[PDB]
Amino acid sequence: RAGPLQWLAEKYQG
């Protein structure tokens, strides 16, 4: 995970 943020953004929008 070269940027632990994208997955959180997806998670929030879900």
Return residues touching ligand *CCCCC* (CB under 6 A). 6, 9-10, 13
What Rg do the C-alpha atoms of the chain give, in angstroms? 7
Q: Are 6 and 13 in contact (CB under 8 A)?
A: no
Distance of closest approach, residue 3 Cβ to ligand *CCCCC*, in angstroms: 10
Distance CA 12, CA 6 (A): 10
- Unique residue bearing structure tokens 């929030």: 12
Distance of closest approach, residue 9 Cβ to ligand *CCCCC*, in angstroms: 4
Residue nearest to ligand *CCCCC* (CB): 9
Distance of closest approach, residue 2 Cβ to ligand *CCCCC*, in angstroms: 14
